[PDB]
Structure formats: C-alpha cells, structure tokens
Amino acid sequence: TLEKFVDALPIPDTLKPVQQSKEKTYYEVTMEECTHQLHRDLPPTRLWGYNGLFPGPTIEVKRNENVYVKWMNNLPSTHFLPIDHTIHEPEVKTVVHLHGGVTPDDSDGYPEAWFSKDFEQTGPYFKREVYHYPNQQRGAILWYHDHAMALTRLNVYAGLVGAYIIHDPKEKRLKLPSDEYDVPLLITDRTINEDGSLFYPSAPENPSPSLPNPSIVPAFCGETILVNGKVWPYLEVEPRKYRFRVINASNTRTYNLSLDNGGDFIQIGSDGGLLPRSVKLNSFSLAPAERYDIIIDFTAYEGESIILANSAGCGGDVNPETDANIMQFRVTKPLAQKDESRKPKYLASYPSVQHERIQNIRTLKLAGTQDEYGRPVLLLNNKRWHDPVTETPKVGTTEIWSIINPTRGTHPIHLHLVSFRVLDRRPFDIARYQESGELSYTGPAVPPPPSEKGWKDTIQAHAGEVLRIAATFGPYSGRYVWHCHILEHEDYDMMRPMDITD
Numbered sequence: 001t002l003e004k005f006v007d008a009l010p011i012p013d014t015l016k017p018v019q020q021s022k023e024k025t026y027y028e029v030t031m032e033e034c035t036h037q038l039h040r041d042l043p044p045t046r047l048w049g050y051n052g053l054f055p056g057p058t059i060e061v062k063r064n065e066n067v068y069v070k071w072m073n074n075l076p077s078t079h080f081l082p083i084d085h086t087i088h089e090p091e092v093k094t095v096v097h098l099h100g101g102v103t104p105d106d107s108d109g110y111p112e113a114w115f116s117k118d119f120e121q122t123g124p125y126f127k128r129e130v131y132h133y134p135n136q137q138r139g140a141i142l143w144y145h146d147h148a149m150a151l152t153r154l155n156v157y158a159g160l161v162g163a164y165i166i167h168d169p170k171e172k173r174l175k176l177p178s179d180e181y182d183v184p185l186l187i188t189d190r191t192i193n194e195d196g197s198l199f200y201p202s203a204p205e206n207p208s209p210s211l212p213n214p215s216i217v218p219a220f221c222g223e224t225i226l227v228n229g230k231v232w233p234y235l236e237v238e239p240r241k242y243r244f245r246v247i248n249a250s251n252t253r254t255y256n257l258s259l260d261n262g263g264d265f266i267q268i269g270s271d272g273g274l275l276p277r278s279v280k281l282n283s284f285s286l287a288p289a290e291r292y293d294i295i296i297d298f299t300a301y302e303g304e305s306i307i308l309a310n311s312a313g314c315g316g317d318v319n320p321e322t323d324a325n326i327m328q329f330r331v332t333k334p335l336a337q338k339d340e341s342r343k344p345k346y347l348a349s350y351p352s353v354q355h356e357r358i359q360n361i362r363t364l365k366l367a368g369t370q371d372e373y374g375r376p377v378l379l380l381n382n383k384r385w386h387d388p389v390t391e392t393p394k395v396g397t398t399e400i401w402s403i404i405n406p407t408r409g410t411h412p413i414h415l416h417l418v419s420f421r422v423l424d425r426r427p428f429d430i431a432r433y434q435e436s437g438e439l440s441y442t443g444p445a446v447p448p449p450p451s452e453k454g455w456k457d458t459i460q461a462h463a464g465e466v467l468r469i470a471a472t473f474g475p476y477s478g479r480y481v482w483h484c485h486i487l488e489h490e491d492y493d494m495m496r497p498m499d500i501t502d
C-alpha cells in the first residue's frame with residue numbers, strides 16, 4: 001500500500017470571475033475529464049473535474065454578493081464508472097448543487113434538472129444554464145458537487161466536488177486566522193488500482209447471481225484517504241494558529257478525527273456558520289457532507305509531525321496502516337509574520353434567541369424494502385423518490401421534524417435550502433417499533449452537545465434513536481429535496497422532494 005505523507009497538500013486556487021462589477025459576479029466552470037497524479041508513486045488517474053481540477057476550484061464570496069455560475073458539462077458521452085441501469089436519455093447527466101446554498105429553486109441543482117454535454121438534452125425540471133447564488137445567508141463553509149438523478153454517487157466519486165466559502169465582513173473583527181492561514185480540507189476516501197485508475201465497485205462482494213450487473217451497492221468504503229486530491233498528504237505549517245474548513249466529501253465514510261500528539265481542535269463553526277461559542281474538542285465525528293470550521297493552534301508544537309488520525313471504521317475497524325490516517329501536519333515553516341489571529345470564545349448570537357412558533361411537526365421514518373433482485377432499497381417514510389410529494393412546509397414557517405431511525409446504522413440527513421437547530425436525540429425500542437409501529441422510549445431526551453448548538457444542515461441520525469430538529473423554511477418557496485447524504489443510499493432511493501409552498 002501507498003506510503004503515507006510523501007506529497008504536499010494541494011491548496012486549490014481560488015476561482016477568478018469571468019466578469020465582476022459591484023452589481024454582479026459571473027463565473028464559468030466547465031466539467032472535464034482530466035488526469036492527475038493522486039500519489040508520488042502512482043501513474044496519473046483519469047478523473048472528472050470542475051475546470052479539470054480535483055477538487056474543483058475554491059470559490060470565495062461575500063455575504064449578499066450577487067453571484068452567477070454557469071456550470072457546463074464538457075465531459076465524455078460515456079461514463080467510466082459502473083452504471084446500474086435498474087435503479088431508475090443520455091448516459092452522462094450532470095447537475096451542480098451548492099450544498100448549504102440559500103438558493104432559488106431552479107439554481108439549486110435539482111436531481112432532475114440535469115443536463116448532458118453542452119446542454120444538448122435536459123431533464124424535466126431544467127430551467128436555466130447560469131445558476132444564481134444571491135448568498136443572503138450567514139458566512140459559512142459550503143461545498144459544491146454533482147447531484148444528478150441516480151448518478152450522484154458515481155459523478156461525485158469521479159471527482160466532482162469543490163469548496164465554496166461565504167465571508168461575512170462583520171466576522172472580520174473576531175480576527176480569526178485568515179488568508180494563507182485559512183485552509184480547506186476536503187476529505188475523500190478512494191480505492192485506487194495498481195495502474196492508478198479509480199476503482200468503484202461493480203457489484204457487492206459475493207454477488208447473488210440474481211443481481212444485475214452492474215449493481216449499485218449500499219455502501220462504499222475506500223482503501224485510501226485523500227485530502228484535497230492527494231493520498232495521505234502532509235502540510236507544512238508555521239508554529240501559530242490556523243483555521244481549517246473541514247469538509248467530508250466522501251460517498252459513505254464517516255470520520256472520527258483526532259491529533260496524535262493529543263492536541264485540541266477549537267471548533268468555531270458548523271455547517272450553517274459560526275457557533276455562538278467556541279468549543280475545545282479532543283475528537284469529533286464528521287459524516288458525509290458535514291463541515292467543521294476549526295482552529296488548530298500549532299504554537300507549542302514547533303518541529304513536530306502531527307498526524308490527523310481517524311478512529312471510525314467503515315465496513316470494519318480502521319487499519320492503523322491505512323484509513324486510521326488522514327494527513328500529517330509538519331510544524332517546520334518559519335513565521336512569515338507575528339500571529340495576530342485570535343481564538344475568541346464569543347463568536348455569534350445564539351440560535352435559541354429566536355422564538356418561532358411551531359407551525360407543524362412531521363414524523364419521518366428511515367426504512368426500506370427489498371427489490372426483485374434481493375437488494376435493500378432505502379426509503380424515507382416508505383416512499384420512493386417518484387411518489388407524490390409529502391413534505392410540503394409553508395414558506396416562512398417553522399417545523400419540528402422527528403426522524404425515527406430503526407435501522408442498524410447512522411444516516412446523515414440533509415435538508416436543502418435551510419439550516420436548522422438540533423433539539424434532542426432519544427433512544428427507542430426498535431423491535432417494538434418494527435412489530436407494531438408504536439414508539440416507546442427507553443431513556444430521556446439528550447440535548448445536543450455544544451458542537452450542535454449552532455446551525456446545521458446535515459445531521460447524524462443514529463440507530464435506535466429519534467432525532468428532533470427545528471427548521472424555518474425560507475426565505476424562498478419552490479421545489480427542493482431532503483435526503484440521506486450517504487450517496488449510495490441517496491441514489492436508491494433515500495431521497496424525497498420537498499415543496500416549500502406559498
């Protein structure tokens with residue numbers, strides 16, 4: 001296996017606009033098949049990249065900056081990863097979703113607003129080529145990726161991901177580490193063949209001969225961990241405070257991260273922006289699509305090599321030699337200047353300041369059935385994607401969603417458009433729920449830890465629990481989605497439409 005910590009961490013370039021004025025910023029991003037070396041000892045890997053880059057370029061905006069991005073498909077007409085034709089027209093369909101984006105519906109990248117090369121064919125919900133992001137939201141770490149119906153796991157695995165950072169200039173005063181000392185970390189697990197080509201499985205192992213070929217799989221666990229498009233890389237840092245925007249851009253894998261010298265992370269931010277108060281943590285779980293905005297203070301570790309480690313298994317216990325490792329920091333870079341950054345305690349106003357009336361309470365179950373080939377089909381509330389819409393909140397109103405998970409594992413549940421608050425989690429009797437539908441608690445409600453006291457948009461719903469969240473649906477109305485962000489689940493078929501009505 002590949003030797004750890006021999007390639008420098010790439011820092012993706014910030015995308016430059018094609019046109020910019022005070023009224024409007026316009027970008028163009030083209031999806032391209034490209035080859036890049038993922039490790040010193042591999043031949044170049046054929047990938048699909050935004051502007052031919054993996055990850056895609058980092059886009060940086062200000063709060064309320066009036067942004068447009070023409071996302072274009074210039075990919076080949078055939079995929080290179082295995083497509084299962086029985087879970088759902090051109091073969092290659094793409095659509096770009098800005099995850100976390102407070103976005104009008106027709107710029108949100110609905111799964112059925114896909115487009116093939118040069119927009120030759122378009123899905124039935126396509127309206128526009130040039131997406132509009134008015135960015136009328138809290139400063140935060142967002143990220144962009146493909147969201148095409150029934151291909152999301154493949155197109156994302158192929159390399160279609162990037163970071164998108166919204167900067168609110170009212171946050172400048174906190175003096176958090178900035179510029180060179182503010183670094184995104186997009187984490188993606190991959191399996192890589194000897195010839196350097198990506199491996200994505202064609203079928204579960206020990207395929208029942210009942211199975212079609214290719215067959216979707218319910219979960220994907222990569223052998224190797226990349227950050228910013230390199231296998232187990234190293235970052236030289238100066239002995240001072242750094243901010244990192246940590247984004248789990250992996251298909252299935254959840255990470256549980258720590259520093260091997262026992263140092264602390266200082267979490268300043270969640271999916272939806274700055275927490276009200278910074279939190280000192282030794283470790284943290286980060287499931288697909290969650291983001292953690294953290295300060296790491298390398299001040300006291302000059303000269304040290306410090307591994308960002310991982311304790312969470314994927315399909316097994318972590319292997320100390322492989323997936324127990326993420327990346328390595330080397331505190332050997334000389335100070336370019338005095339560390340004037342800060343790690344304040346007092347970051348933002350609490351979400352609990354808000355007093356909204358509860359218009360409605362939805363009860364949603366995570367469940368599934370079995371198809372004609374014997375495979376698990378994962379379903380939100382026992383509905384298929386294609387069934388008539390049932391989650392129909394009214395614009396401007398607040399709902400509590402109770403999410404009941406009687407399955408064996410966690411699902412990271414994600415709602416488009418909004419960020420939301422975490423109210424609490426509560427264990428329940430699974431066997432009883434499965435036998436009779438009746439909901440009996442085995443213990444009291446647990447409120448969120450401080451990490452979850454701010455704004456979230458992707459939230460881990462653990463097994464044998466009920467999770468309650470509270471969201472205000474707005475400011476736009478329209479047609480959006482909600483889904484498990486395990487892409488293998490999402491595509492079959494753990495994704496529903498969500499209509500925010502007027």
Ligand SMILES: CCn1/c(=N/N=c2\sc3cc(S(=O)(=O)O)ccc3n2CC)sc2cc(S(=O)(=O)O)ccc21
Pocket residue numbers: 204218219220221252253254313314315316376407408409410
């Ligand atoms: C429940 C969702 N889910 C999986 N489902 N797939 C299943 S469950 C299952 C049971 C049987 S049985 O009934 O014959 O026993 C046969 C086939 C099955 N398959 C098909 C292969 S695999 C998975 C891994 C992780 S992890 O990777 O994050 O640890 C997380 C969540 C996951």
Ligand SMILES: [Cu+]
Pocket residue numbers: 097099145289485
């Ligand atoms: Cu996403």
Ligand SMILES: [Cu+]
Pocket residue numbers: 097098099100414415416417
């Ligand atoms: Cu999203």
Ligand SMILES: [Cu+]
Pocket residue numbers: 378410411412484485486489490494
């Ligand atoms: Cu799931």
Ligand SMILES: [Cu+]
Pocket residue numbers: 097147414416481483
């Ligand atoms: Cu989504």
